[PDB]
């Protein structure tokens, strides 16, 4: 997934030369430099008289991108006698197949025609040139005396080649023995030493080669493609070859023992004409030491979802088991007629992740069919079935499909940066492209929230620049990075994190950073490539509750990072890359809430106390009763809290003490149910933890009943909580009292009289009212000012009867109002008449007449009155004794409340007295 698709290095050769048909690296152990080998099987050469003999070019890597030929040969056709040419090098396709190893370059010309020693002829045996150091030799194993099609005449040796671990060549010829094909393996040491230019049919002593077989096997093309690996544990590479046309064209692959060339295994294709065996490879793909086999079938026709067969190309992957058996999985192509599997090229460990990778090509796919190359990664249980990258050809056809990806080569590191590179051939456009592998960084990131559970009220932090105190929490982030290769010493990570991301979609913002950087924090980290997590942290504080409303969704901070590649690229401009599966973002959330615990119900503790405004209540009238109450919840929040007071029959609700600004303006109402009567008030929802309240309630007391001594009420506080939802019942009482504020009053009419009496005449005895003197009326009243009633009472009046043995005031009759009866100790109307300074006269100075009255029940405001009609006796004032005296006549009265109906309450007697007077003076002054 890490190949540098941006700015690859491109090489091109002569136009129409098939440049890039076969590609490979060159590793001269004696020199520090490295080169690419590119084959041009149709380029013209300077060989005298040879037309399109082909050539192999060596292309530099550093600063030039130049390509130059390799002087494998510089001679035309050799002659046999004088003019009969020995060989025909024109159109031989030299450079069609290339392999290199250390400092050995092996190039083959599959189409070299040979004549023969026995007769004038023309047969394509094929030849190879092997350059080792400064020495160059020709290796033509099939150029033998097996004369014609019955033998090696049409061998076309060099069609496909490969080097072994043991420095031994493997070479395939598909045309030998009636096209049964042939594999030939010869040691490099012998090829370089046994070569003699003057002998054409050179015989090699240490040769391993297959041999013809029955007639059924004609036209199998054994040796079409070859690869080398060890498939029996003997330590020396064996030979893998694909026979695309065998078994009624099904196609097979042959595994031949690398020692003594015997047959070990044969893979069989599944669909005729699929060309199972066009390309093969062998590499360790799943961590076993055992080599795992890959086979391509570019023309395999898959059955689509609709039931149609369609050409997609298929690759078969076989995993070698310790017992030697193979477990096989088949991998299909991804677009029709793209020929997926035309080329397979192991890449080494493209990411150094511990398992080798493989690249597979579909040279006729993509847009405009410019070719595509897929990249797969080996996993511990086989190949990864999903490609991790795709390379697309950038060159459009000129006269032929570009065939980008027809031939690739991997498992070599031109950089020496630890990661293998990859070459790709696009010979249709005569170009070869080199892809470099970017260093891979694995990054581990850490995120921590302190605390994980967040109580809102944990005010700890102070806002800078102010005395404000704000709830806050600690959040810390960490990252750690390292990679297996040439990587810079220090890496600049740009990491940013913002708070509660998943609800910043236009909604309110909630938490802030210590500097209020819009819940957004971005910082650079110059992490040194190593093992340190290098954590860092900042403190985030929630803004005031009045500014946000989300108390349910947990705060979900978010953090992400990205590497500054332009600083992390080496001097050649190659940029690192992060691991494919490493996520560049991460987030965490905390539980910001107060929730009464898991059960979601708080446990309150409710209590109440009360004081009474009315210390004592007097029976007899409606009394407003005010109770002052303090309510408290010492426990957790109480949902739907209420204040409750139960009341008796003798009272009723009034309201609340609303005017008192020191008491709560409680909402209250009155209820009655099942003979139960109560007062209800609201304390809000919830009643918060530890909150205290004070309020006043108004009751009306209708205590006119006589046998009760006190009024009793019960208070309580309750809520809707499942736990402790009622406070203890708090009973309270107020004592009753008795108070009959009774007083005695009186008045006189007229208030004064003038002597001598106008129009009056003296007579021996009176017969009518006018005979005695002026009429005077006296009134006395017993009145109650208190609410309490009294069942019985007594009233007494004193009256001056005679002074100096002569009458002062004469009574005619007395009248009664209210519930009383009266009687006089002296006969009223004894004659039974026809109905200087002012001195004081009274019973203390004169003979006293007394009137006593009995009184029944009475109430507040009610009163009973005694009226008296009297005549002022005239003789006492017109006598000579008082002709120079002015008098004020005095009278007085008293009372007692003797009984009350409220016998159950403490009682005391109530008494008092008053006086009423009339004035008599001389209007006409007599002589002194």
């Amino acid at each position: 997934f890490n190949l540098d698709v941006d700015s690859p290095a491109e090489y091109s050769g002569p136009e129409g030369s098939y440049f890039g048909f076969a590609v490979d690296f060159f590793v001269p152990s004696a020199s520090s430099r490295m080169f690419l080998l590119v084959g041009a099987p149709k380029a013209n050469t300077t060989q005298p008289g040879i037309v399109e003999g082909g050539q192999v070019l060596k292309c530099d890597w550093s600063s030039t991108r130049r390509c130059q030929p390799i002087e494998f040969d510089a001679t035309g056709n050799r002659d046999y006698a004088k003019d009969d040419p020995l060989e025909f090098k024109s159109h031989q396709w030299f450079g069609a197949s290339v392999r290199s190893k250390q400092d050995k370059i092996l190039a083959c010309a599959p189409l070299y025609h040979w004549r023969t020693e026995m007769k004038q002829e023309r047969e394509p045996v094929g030849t190879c040139f092997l350059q080792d150091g400064t020495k160059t030799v020709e290796y033509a194993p099939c150029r033998s005396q097996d004369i014609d099609a019955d033998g090696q005449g049409f061998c076309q040796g060099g069609f496909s080649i490969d080097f072994t671990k043991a420095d031994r060549v493997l070479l395939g010829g598909p045309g030998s023995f009636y096209w049964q094909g042939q594999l030939i393996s010869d040691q490099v040491a012998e090829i370089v030493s046994k070569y003699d230019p003057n002998v054409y049919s050179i015989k090699y002593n240490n040769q391993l080669a297959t041999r013809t077989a029955q007639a059924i096997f004609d036209d199998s093309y054994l040796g079409y493609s070859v690869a080398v690996g060890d498939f029996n544990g003997d330590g020396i590479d064996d030979f893998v070859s694909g026979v695309p046309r065998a078994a009624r064209t099904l196609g097979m692959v042959y595994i031949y023992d690398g020692k003594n060339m015997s047959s070990l295994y044969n893979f069989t294709g599944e669909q005729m004409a699929a060309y199972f065996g066009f390309s093969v490879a062998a590499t360790d793909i799943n961590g076993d030491d055992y080599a795992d086999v890959f086979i391509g079938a570019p023309l395999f026709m898959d059955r689509g979802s609709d039931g149609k067969l369609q050409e997609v190309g298929q690759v078969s992957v076989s995993l070698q088991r310790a017992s030697g058996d193979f477990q096989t999985t088949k991998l299909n192509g991804f677009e029709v007629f793209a020929r997926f599997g035309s080329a397979i090229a192991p890449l080494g460990d493209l990411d150094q992740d511990g398992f080798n990778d493989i690249a597979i090509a579909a040279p006729y796919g993509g847009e405009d069919k410019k070719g595509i190359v897929y990249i797969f990664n080996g996993r511990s249980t086989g190949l990864n079935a999903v490609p991790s990258q795709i390379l697309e050809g950038q060159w459009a056809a000129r006269s032929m499909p570009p065939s980008f990806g027809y031939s690739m080569k991997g498992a070599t590191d031109i950089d020496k940066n630890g990661y293998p590179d990859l070459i790709v051939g696009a010979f249709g456009v005569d170009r070869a492209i080199l892809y470099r592998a970017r260093p891979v960084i694995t990054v581990n990131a850490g995120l921590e929230v302190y605390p994980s559970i967040l109580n809102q009220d944990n005010k700890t932090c102070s806002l800078p620049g102010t005395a404000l105190k704000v709830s806050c929490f600690n959040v810390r982030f960490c990252l750690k990075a390292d990679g297996k290769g040439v990587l810079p010493r220090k890496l600049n990570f740009q990491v940013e994190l913002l708070l509660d991301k998943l609800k910043q979609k236009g909604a309110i913002r909630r938490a802030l950073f210590l500097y209020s950087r819009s819940p957004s924090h971005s910082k650079n980290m110059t992490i040194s490539r190593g093992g340190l997590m290098q954590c860092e942290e900042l403190i985030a504080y929630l803004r005031d509750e009045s500014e946000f409303r989300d108390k349910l969704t947990p705060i979900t901070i978010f953090m992400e990072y990205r590497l500054d590649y332009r600083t992390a690229a080496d001097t050649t401009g190659l940029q690192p890359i992060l691991n494919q599966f490493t996520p560049a973002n991460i987030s965490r959330q905390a539980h910001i809430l107060l929730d009464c615990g898991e059960d979601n119900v708080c446990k309150p503790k409710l209590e109440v106390s009360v004081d009474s405004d009315q210390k004592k209540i007097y029976i007899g009238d409606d009394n407003p009763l005010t109770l002052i109450v303090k309510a408290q919840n010492q426990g957790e929040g109480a949902y739907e809290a209420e204040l409750i007071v139960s009341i008796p029959l003798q009272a009723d609700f009034i309201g609340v003490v609303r005017n008192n600004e020191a008491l709560a303006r409680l909402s209250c109402a009155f209820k009655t149910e099942n003979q139960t009567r109560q007062v209800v008030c609201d304390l809000g929802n919830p009643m918060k933890a530890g909150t205290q309240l004070l309020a006043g309630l108004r009751f009306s007391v209708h205590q006119q009943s006589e046998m009760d001594t006190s009024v009793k009420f019960d208070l309580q506080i309750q809520s809707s909580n499942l736990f402790d939802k009622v406070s203890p019942v708090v009973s309270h009482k107020v004592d009753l009292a008795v108070l009959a504020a009774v007083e005695i009053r009186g008045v006189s009419s007229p208030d004064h009289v003038f002597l001598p009496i106008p129009n009056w005449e003296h007579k021996e005895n009176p017969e009518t009212e006018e005979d005695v003197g002026p009429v005077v009326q006296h009134i006395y009243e017993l009145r109650n000012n208190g609410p309490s009633s009294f069942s019985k009472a007594m009233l007494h009046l004193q009256w001056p009867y005679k002074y100096n043995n002569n009458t002062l005031l004469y009574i005619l009759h007395y009248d009664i109002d209210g519930p009383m009866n009266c009687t006089s100790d002296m006969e009223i109307n004894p004659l039974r008449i026809k109905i200087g300074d002012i001195h004081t006269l009274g019973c203390g100075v004169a003979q006293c007449l007394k009137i006593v009255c009995q009184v029944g029940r009475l109430d507040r405001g009610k009163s009973a009155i005694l009226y008296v009609k009297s005549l002022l006796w005239t003789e006492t004032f017109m006598n000579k004794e008082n002709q120079n005296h002015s008098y004020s006549l005095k009278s007085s009265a008293s009372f007692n409340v003797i009984e009350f109906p409220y016998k159950n309450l403490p009682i005391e007697d109530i008494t008092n007295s008053t006086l009423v007077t009339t004035n008599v003076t001389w209007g006409i002054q007599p002589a002194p």
């Binding site: 098939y18 189409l111 025609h113 004038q120 023309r122 394509p124 099609a149 076309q156 598909p174 045309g175 009636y178 004609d218 036209d219 093309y221 046309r245 009624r248 064209t249 669909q271 005729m272 004409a273 060309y275 066009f278 570019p298 023309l299 026709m301 609709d306 039931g307 067969l309 369609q310 050409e311 029709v336 007629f337 020929r339 006729y364 032929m400 499909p401 065939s403 236009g506 909604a507 309110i508 009045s546 946000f548 409303r549 409606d622 009723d652 609700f653 009034i654 309201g655 909402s667 209250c668 109402a669 009155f670 209820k671 609201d682 809000g684 929802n685 009306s700 209708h702 008045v747 009419s749």
Partner: protein, 593 residues
């Protein structure tokens, strides 16, 4: 049901739910019920009949010509498939079914192109087929009265190692070695364009002569490709049964074999037969693969017959099973029975029928249930066999769509293999409601017209496009009595600034903040407002005869009037129904005593 329970809106997701759901777009919408539901449930709420969308899938018929009875009629008139054009309309996830009839008509025009291998072992066959034109016409006159015959031959690519390139005179006489003469090498030559003149086939065959290839595999497939894609030179008719008889007695080359000879350029679907009737690109283009061969045989509607000797019959049977619309027959070495071979091959070929789906979009899927011989039905199959020719068969096609494609006017074709009589399908998807035009786009009910009838954004989209959630300075717009005060005075809860005040068995609450109620008024002298008023937001409103906060004071004066007629007898002042006697020496309720 699903339509309601999914809670979708906008009439588009409602259609997307299920084919059964329907939508209502009344202006006078009734409240409290979802606008998305099946048609009957919408009609229960009395959504206007023209205001319900409820699109319904269907399958029409645009051309329904009858199947022909004979093939010798006017060429354009022959019709072997009915209906011929169909337009079907369906919802983003529904399915619909329709049927198709096919009848292999009798006496249909026939085109035979005898493509013949010409390797040296074919000389006896080339001798034996010198009368084949006339014999074949004589036999075929029973089956078809508009016959045509052609010819063409192939050996292999003319390039080493396939052909003898030495000694130098061998390339001009490949049979030079065995002391006899034969044609040079050639890939494929077009001999006789299809023609009705049967006799001229015999004339043209006699001018042929065999050649010589080095190896057994023949290059026939490259010949079949050109005989298929070079239709104008071959002369294939549009209205005829194309037979391509292929005769051989050896195995065949296949793609990617051309690499041995230096040929790497892949084959392509083009004609390269030059004006000299020789396939020109034989030496610069690889062999064609079975996939490409099958594609071009399907496009050009060619029935290909493999006539091959008994030694390679099985190979070509296994090859044929990979190429739809082909058969195999056994030739003698002398090729004595090719006539009967072709007759029986034609009979067998047209004794079956299979359907091709040509250009189906990825968003569709088809399933087939085939009515077959004797009115029997076979499920799952898209083909039938055992027909007697002339009979008729039919298939039940069932199609389902996958979601809502971004474009709703695609089309495709269904066609039997080997014939052009096809059914062309026009498909459209009803993703959008009609009300999406001219009705929904905008409405002033939402954000003063800034909302599709709604679909506005932050600030209004909280609900009915008139609620805010971007600012939250909250959903309790003035639910509390004053700024910062409890919501609804804690007498209930609110949304969008309106308190849903709670009810009680002992009273009920009103007001935007729940600040008023009908029970919180005062009591005095045993009853509320003294029985002289009524409660309103905690205050008493007193009657005409009463005053005071408790309604405790009477405004009347008849209780203060004295028998003399004066209020309080003029001795005091009346207050709350009683007289405050100011004059000393006077008493009574009105100071009248």
């Amino acid at each position: 049901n699903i339509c309601t329970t999914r809670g979708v809106s906008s009439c588009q997701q409602c259609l997307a739910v299920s084919p059964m759901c329907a939508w209502c777009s009344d202006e006078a919408l009734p409240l409290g019920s979802p606008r998305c539901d099946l048609k009957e449930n919408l009609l229960k709420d009395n959504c206007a009949p023209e205001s319900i969308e409820f699109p319904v899938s269907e399958a029409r018929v645009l051309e329904d010509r009858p199947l022909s009875d004979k093939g010798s009629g006017d060429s354009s008139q022959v019709t072997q498939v009915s209906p011929q054009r169909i337009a079907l309309r369906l919802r983003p996830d529904d399915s619909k079914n329709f049927s198709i009839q096919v009848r292999q008509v009798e006496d249909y025009p026939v085109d035979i192109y005898y493509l013949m291998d010409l390797s040296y072992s074919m000389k006896d066959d080339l001798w034996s087929i010198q009368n084949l034109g006339t014999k074949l016409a004589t036999q075929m006159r029973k089956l078809t009265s508009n016959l045509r015959i052609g010819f063409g031959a192939f050996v292999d690519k003319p390039v080493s190692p396939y052909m003898y390139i030495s000694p130098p005179e061998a390339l001009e006489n490949p049979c030079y070695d065995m002391k006899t003469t034969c044609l040079p090498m050639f890939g494929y030559k077009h001999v006789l364009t299809l023609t009705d003149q049967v006799t001229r086939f015999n004339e043209e065959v006699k001018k042929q002569s065999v050649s010589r290839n080095r190896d057994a595999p023949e290059g026939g497939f490259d010949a079949i490709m050109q005989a298929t894609v070079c239709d104008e030179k071959i002369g294939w008719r549009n209205d005829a049964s194309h037979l391509l008889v292929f005769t051989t007695d050896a195995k065949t080359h296949i793609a990617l074999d051309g690499r041995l000879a230096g040929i790497v350029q892949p084959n392509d679907g083009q004609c390269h037969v030059g004006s000299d009737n020789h396939y020109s690109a034989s030496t610069t283009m690889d062999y064609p693969s079975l996939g490409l061969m099958t594609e071009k045989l399907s496009q050009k509607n060619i029935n290909l017959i493999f006539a091959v000797t008994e030694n390679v019959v099985n190979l070509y049977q296994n090859y044929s099973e990979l190429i739809p619309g082909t058969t195999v027959g056994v030739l003698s070495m002398d090729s004595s029975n090719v006539l009967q071979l072709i007759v029986d091959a034609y009979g067998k070929i047209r004794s079956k029928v299979e359907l091709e789906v040509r250009d189906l979009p990825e968003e569709l899927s088809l399933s087939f249930n085939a009515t077959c011989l004797n009115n029997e039905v076979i499920p799952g199959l898209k083909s039938c066999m055992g027909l007697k020719i002339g009979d008729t068969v039919s298939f039940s096609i069932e199609a389902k769509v996958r979601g809502c494609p971004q474009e709703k006017e695609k089309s495709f074709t269904i066609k039997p293999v080997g014939f052009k009589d096809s059914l062309i399908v026009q498909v459209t998807f009803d993703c959008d409601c009609a009300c999406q035009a001219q009705a929904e786009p905008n409405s002033h009910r939402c954000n003063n017209g800034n909302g599709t009838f709604c679909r506005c954004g932050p600030g209004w989209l909280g609900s009915q496009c008139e609620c805010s959630e971007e600012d939250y300075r909250s959903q309790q717009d003035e639910c509390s009595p004053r700024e910062g005060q409890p919501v609804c005075s804690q007498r209930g809860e609110c949304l969008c600034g309106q308190c849903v005040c709670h009810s009680s068995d002992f009273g009920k609450i009103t007001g935007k903040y729940c600040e008023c109620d009908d029970f919180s008024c005062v009591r005095y002298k045993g009853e509320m407002c003294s029985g002289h008023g009524q409660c309103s937001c905690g205050d008493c409103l007193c009657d005409s005869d009463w005053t005071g906060y408790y309604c405790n004071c009477t405004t009347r004066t008849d209780t203060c009037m004295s028998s003399n007629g004066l209020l309080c007898s003029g001795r005091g002042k009346c207050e709350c129904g009683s007289c405050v006697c100011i004059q000393p020496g006077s008493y009574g309720d009105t100071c009248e005593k």
